[PDB]
Nucleic acid binder design. Structure first.
Ligand SMILES: [Mg+2]
Ligand SMILES: [Mg+2]
Ligand SMILES: [Zn+2]
Ligand SMILES: [Zn+2]
Lengths: 387, 424
DNA sequence: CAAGCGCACCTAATTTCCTAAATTAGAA
DNA sequence: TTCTAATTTAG
RNA sequence: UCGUCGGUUCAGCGACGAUAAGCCGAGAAGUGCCAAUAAAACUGUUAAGUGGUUUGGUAACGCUCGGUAAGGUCCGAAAGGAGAACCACUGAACGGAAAUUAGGUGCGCUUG
């Protein structure tokens, strides 16, 4: 629903980077003053003040803590926009109400705010418009009428933001109407000395319904117990078998030093293999329902180079199929052929740590490549056509 | 005198109490310590807010004696927390509060400027014990008993503990040398703490004490230099003698990589795990890595303890009086050193306090071209040759390991001034 | 694999601290 | 009546 | 292979536990979901517009708080038994506690 994305600020559109930078640092002092004062006033509002406060010298007229704080801090913080001051004060007082019980009990001292504090912004005070020559501009309303006059920054402060990549996909929907702005912030990073514009956006999450056209493959890996990949998204999931290696070392050592006892150790092995299969099968199907795939392609089932070595391989299929087919997903058993020794990037049919295509040069994890290769619709034939 | 050190003693059995009553007390007082620490920090921040509003509205700062009724924020904090943390000893509560307010007073400028957040104190806070509230007496038979004053007058009439709480402590090994000196008078017990170790479910009596260091006769013109190398954990060289002493690593990050790999492997396994591992909060889901609590920290602590002792012993064995090392605050050539994620500050901090017990002065110098300057000719080639291993300069043909010429350089007195006057 | 957000959990670097004097209440 | 442990507060 | 005990850390050794990267119970502070309700603030002649507050329920949560194995000896046929009593090795080291800053990691949602 409410997600954020950073857009680094290139340069001020009408100001210099010195005059613009100075204004931001003054608005940062007023933001931090408002955040700390709103905590003091929320500290008094809850009746937490000590006796000496209103005894030697120092109901209130308003209804909420935000109302009492906003009017008190309004006088001094006269540079921030009146809208943005409400959002800054709301953050401080909502954090005090969140931590109220720990503050009273004594499990926490007091909420604190860092020096390089973000500058809040409301929906109506941020607007992104695209210029015809492929430029992205974000007009920001940051100053109040008294501050605009003194600072000679009349109109809004426009900044150019680098929008390239996933941002251009999100941003181009904000301008159309699919995504709508909710709030915003102007963050500062001291390790790059760059200003950012976090534009939170509100949307309707996509409803993922099972599709018989999206395919999720499974790779019985060598260093990973299982690997999952998709050809419609770079998303990947891996069923690592760190617990399986430890159990096999445990049993072997106990078998050596065990020389009924052997009968009980064999019974434990059968249970572990079955339960691990249940956990492994459920994860595979759950990571398929999440991605909206309705087809699970995999191999058909000695020890092999596969990570599981000796294992109830046939039992795992009869639990992958049963769990997948309880949710509408079908299973296609595709022979391995040369899926591992093939390039998913340029279709180069042609150690095992990283696979590097000799022509295309794509280098990625071998188990991941063997999973994308399996994931291709009807990979079995297209390899057979080349071989 | 002049040095303070601690030694833990394990508490085996509480005399005249069960382990289910003493454990209940020790955790009740572990919550009043957290309350006192956290509430006394609120009063320091509150009083600071009052002062800022007073100066703007009245010209000059207010006086605590006239508004709070006390000459310090510590006294007012004691007056307000005394009614709620009524189980702690008054002495112990006073020291606990003093730590909270002194921390605030030390970093008050940073707190106002936003550079430092207001301190917040955790659940498993150690329990404070003053010098006057700790007494160790050993019976003839050979069993040490520590008498502790942990309770207040209302508490001693609610828990039915008429006198101090006596606990049996194990005193063996180097703890026997320290304790027998405390019972004599060579060492004076300072304010101490009670700590809980979660891995073994054991309570330790961390006793801090004061001891006069031994003063060996060591010339101050003898300097040993230490270089944290790339193929060796640390290298030591001297200017006067062509003697080298090297601390080859052996096992340094083998431990760290084999602990993080399990920690990530355990957490990643939680996504597909047994039914009982989910649905019981954060602790029961991250529970498998609770066996890896401080294995890395303890391994790096003991390993650095051995290295510092070896380094200081070589300085004493060769008669060295000054130990010059690098000031790595500038963050120079990290990762490529033999130690990669090691605690280079724990090694340096340990050498300092283990050299002052030996009467050895420690001087940190600014590492600038230290590993690039040939130690015989004195010609700082901006580009030496090889990245590591053998280093051959071109004014003299001097050949040696890059870690021995980086330890024969730090060993030169006032080399920090010399190097600058070779580039300006 | 990458990037935003929310949370918590680790580890390194770094600083500060590791009270006393006087008064009172309870016990022999 | 002495005194040893606990409380209180200045610096 | 990972842990428990042998005064602390590290390693070894002796005995023991291990499917422990496992099993289980209550509950309602937070997220999520559901049903009621609509404050502050802003822009506006008003009207209206933006914004989302407050209460209850539910129990899916890296939701909260917890429980669960591990030296010898002894009683107990055996389970089991009081954190009951007693006994328990070799080498190196043995200055810590709290907080803060910074970096990283994992989990969950969205997107490429
Ligand atoms: Mg051990
Ligand atoms: Mg030992
Ligand atoms: Zn290719
Ligand atoms: Zn040279």
């Amino acid at each position: 629903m409410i997600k954020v994305y950073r857009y680094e600020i290139v340069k001020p559109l009408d100001l210099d980077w010195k005059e613009f930078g100075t204004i931001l640092r003054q608005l940062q002092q007023e933001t931090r003053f408002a955040l700390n004062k709103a905590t003091q006033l929320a500290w008094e509002w809850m009746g937490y003040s000590s006796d000496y406060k209103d005894n030697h010298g120092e109901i209130l007229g308003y209804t909420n803590v935000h109302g009492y704080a906003y009017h008190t801090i309004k006088t001094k913080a006269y540079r921030l926009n009146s809208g943005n001051l409400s959002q800054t004060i709301k953050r401080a007082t909502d954090r005090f109400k969140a931590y109220q019980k720990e503050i009273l009990r004594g499990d926490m001292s007091i909420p604190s705010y860092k020096r390089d504090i973000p500058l809040d912004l409301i929906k109506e005070n941020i607007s992104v418009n695209r210029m015809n020559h492929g430029d992205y501009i974000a007009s920001l309303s940051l100053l109040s009428n008294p501050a605009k006059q003194e600072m000679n920054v009349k109109r809004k402060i426009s900044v150019i933001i680098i929008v390239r990549g996933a941002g251009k996909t999100i941003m181009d929907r904000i301008l159309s109407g699919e995504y709508q702005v909710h709030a915003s912030q102007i963050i500062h990073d001291d390790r790059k000395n760059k200003w950012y514009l976090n534009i939170s956006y509100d949307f309707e999450p996509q409803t993922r319904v099972l599709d018989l056209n999206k395919i999720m493959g499974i790779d019985l890996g060598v260093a990973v117990a299982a690997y999952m990949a998709f050809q419609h998204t770079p998303a990947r999931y891996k069923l690592e078998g760190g617990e399986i290696e430890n159990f096999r070392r445990q049993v072997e050592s106990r078998r050596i030093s065990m020389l009924k006892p052997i009968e009980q150790l064999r019974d434990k092995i059968a249970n572990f293999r079955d339960t691990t299969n249940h956990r492994y099968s459920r994860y595979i199907v759950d990571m398929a329902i999440k991605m909206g795939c309705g087809t699970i392609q995999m191999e058909d089932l000695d020890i092999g180079s596969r990570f599981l070595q000796n294992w109830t391989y046939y039992d795992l299929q009869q639990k992958i199929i049963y769990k997948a087919e309880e949710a509408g997903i079908k299973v296609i058993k595709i022979d391995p052929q040369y899926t591992s020794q093939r390039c998913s990037e340029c279709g180069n049919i042609d150690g095992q740590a990283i696979f590097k295509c000799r022509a295309c040069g794509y280098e990625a994890n071998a188990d991941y490549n063997a999973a994308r290769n399996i994931a291709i619709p009807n990979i079995d034939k297209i390899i057979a056509e080349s071989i």
